[PDB]
């Protein structure tokens, strides 16, 4: 995360860390959506050009970790199975950059571990509007090094026409961009390592946090004129339901 701040303890209890089992290596962010289902970006697990084509046994996930070992707070889980979106377009623009990982053992919720909510239709309509701000969190790059504390930044959702104009990459209805415009006064953006990390919004209908996006791509980090892109979670929920309800 670029130009953000340290997270407060318990601020993002749904935060999940995806690690490469051996050699131990942090790969991406992810988020807890239940006691046994975790969301992340497909490119975090499948992206041939970078030699990424992981098997479930290739990784592990860490939950409730405040630093880069809290013996009694954080949880370390193995994966039962990975599910990458069938129409994930990795060769072109990263269309439908989403994936689900099912843990071998459900995890017990706590003060430091709890699931983020997945948007319903009216929550999304109302919250997904240009100018409204959301929150990105991650253990990724601080600049185009890495933090020892989970980072956070709030960024405004940008109008589709403007997102399109910011980049030559072909953007889809399955993505959205969020960030400040150079004339806006504030900065911030996700960066390498942050993929899979949640972009959340708090709903006044019920004071609950909802994950509206997944950190997917960008060009450079916190560059003036550029805006980070996120996987449009809601438009892909039916796939989520299909998978989960097997």
């Amino acid at each position: 995360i670029v130009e953000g701040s340290d997270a407060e303890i318990g601020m993002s209890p749904w935060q999940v860390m995806l690690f490469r089992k051996s050699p131990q290596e942090l790969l991406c962010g992810a988020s807890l959506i239940s006691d046994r289902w975790v969301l992340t970006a497909a490119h975090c697990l499948l992206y041939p050009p970078w030699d990424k084509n992981f098997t479930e046994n290739d990784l592990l996930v860490r939950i409730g970790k405040h630093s880069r070992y809290e013996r009694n707070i954080e949880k370390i889980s193995m994966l039962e199975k990975i599910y990458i979106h069938p129409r994930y377009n990795w060769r072109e623009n990263l269309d439908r950059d989403i994936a689900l990982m099912k843990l071998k053992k459900p995890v017990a919720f706590s003060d430091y571990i709890h699931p983020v909510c997945l948007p319903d239709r009216e929550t999304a309509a109302s919250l997904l509007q240009a100018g409204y701000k959301g929150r990105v969190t991650g253990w990724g790059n601080l600049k185009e090094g890495q933090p020892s504390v989970l980072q956070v930044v709030n960024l405004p959702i940008v109008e589709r026409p403007v997102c399109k104009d910011s980049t030559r990459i072909r953007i889809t209805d399955n993505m959205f961009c969020a960030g400040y415009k150079p004339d806006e006064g504030k900065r911030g953006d996700a960066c390498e390592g942050d993929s899979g990390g949640p972009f959340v919004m708090k709903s006044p209908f019920n004071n609950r946090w909802y994950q509206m996006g997944i950190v997917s791509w960008g060009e450079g980090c916190d560059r003036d004129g550029k805006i980070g892109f996120y996987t449009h979670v809601f438009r892909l929920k039916k796939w989520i339901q299909k998978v989960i309800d097997q």
């Binding site: 318990g10 709030n154 006044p204 004071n207 909802y210």
Partner: peptide, 26 residues
């Protein structure tokens, strides 16, 4: 439906240091 309610914040009726920025944007 036990989701999106942080034990150390929502549950203790405490607000984090920046969540008001989100409310302001609405």
């Amino acid at each position: 439906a036990d989701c999106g309610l942080r034990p150390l914040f929502e549950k203790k009726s405490l607000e984090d240091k920046t969540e008001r920025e989100l409310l302001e944007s609405y």
